[PDB]
Design a protein around this ligand. Structure first.
Ligand SMILES: *OS(=O)(=O)CCCCCCCCCCCCCCCC
Ligand SMILES: [Ca+2]
Ligand SMILES: [Ca+2]
Lengths: 13, 240
């Protein structure tokens, strides 16, 4: 979740 | 899902106002360099350690590559004019600090190397310690990336005269369209550069993309060179 967040995306799996 | 993007990934066809043949006089084909080039950027992020400093932190790495390819110059065997290689190592944090409607979402600190992989005399490189801060508010995204040059900069000792000490990034989501602006500006020397973009989805993974760059520091070999470049092509991911 979150649009544009590089870090939030990296935390995902 | 397998690989993570850092910055944008795109391939466009471009035309610059003037090609910097001087800086590249060392290459035999330079005298016949053309103003039209393929420009593309690949940018990946590599999470190495999730949870290093908490549930929402990450020790990570990234790699951004920008290339300028003289495709139409068959006379000279269509050489690459320039590639910039930009590896990074950073600590990232996913945050939710809200202030005046804006939410700080990303806090990133790390080390950046930016070089062009050439030997002398066309060698260009610098090292930076930086922080990247990203905040959003509605259809807006703003990113500030201040830095501190460290180490040797002998290949271009005056690079900060043209690049300054920060990069500002503004995104605007207009429906599925993304308007973007990316820039640098040194107040004390008057030098800077700006990159305006517009993208729109053709499909869920591909976007049409138009870009206009104007000013100094488009690439390392043109850090002290001023040009205006326009381009059209495709994009995978925009900034948001
Ligand atoms: O600027 S220069 O010093 O002249 C050239 C610097 C080039 C840096 C090379 C970095 C390449 C990164 C390769 C990415 C491979 C991804 C694998 C990562 C495994 C975790
Ligand atoms: Ca060739
Ligand atoms: Ca070099």
């Amino acid at each position: 979740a979150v649009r544009g967040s590089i870090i939030a995306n990296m935390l995902q799996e | 899902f397998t690989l993570y993007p850092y910055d944008t990934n795109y391939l466009i066809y471009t035309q610059t106002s003037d090609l910097n043949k001087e800086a590249i006089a060392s290459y035999d084909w330079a005298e016949n360099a053309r103003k039209d080039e393929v420009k593309f950027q690949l940018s990946l992020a590599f999470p190495l350690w999730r949870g290093i400093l908490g549930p929402n932190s990450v020790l990570g790495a990234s790699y951004t590559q920008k290339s300028w390819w003289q495709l139409s110059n068959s006379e000279e065997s269509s050489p690459f004019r320039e590639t910039n290689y930009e590896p990074q190592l950073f600590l990232g944090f996913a945050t939710d600090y809200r202030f005046a409607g804006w939410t700080l979402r990303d806090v990133e600190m790390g080390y950046n190397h930016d070089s062009n992989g050439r030997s002398d005399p066309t060698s260009r490189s610098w090292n930076r310690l930086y922080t990247r801060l990203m905040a959003e508010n509605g259809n807006w995204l703003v990113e500030v990336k201040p830095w501190y040059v460290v180490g040797n900069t002998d290949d271009n000792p005056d690079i900060t005269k043209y690049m300054g000490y920060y990069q500002l990034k503004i995104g605007y989501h207009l429906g599925d369209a993304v308007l973007s602006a990316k820039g640098q500006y040194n107040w004390n020397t008057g030098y800077g550069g700006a990159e305006l973009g517009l993208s729109y989805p053709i499909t869920k993974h591909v976007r049409l993309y138009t870009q206009v760059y104007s000013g100094y520091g488009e690439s390392l070999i043109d850090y002290n060179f001023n040009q205006t470049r326009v381009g059209v092509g495709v994009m995978l991911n925009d900034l948001f």
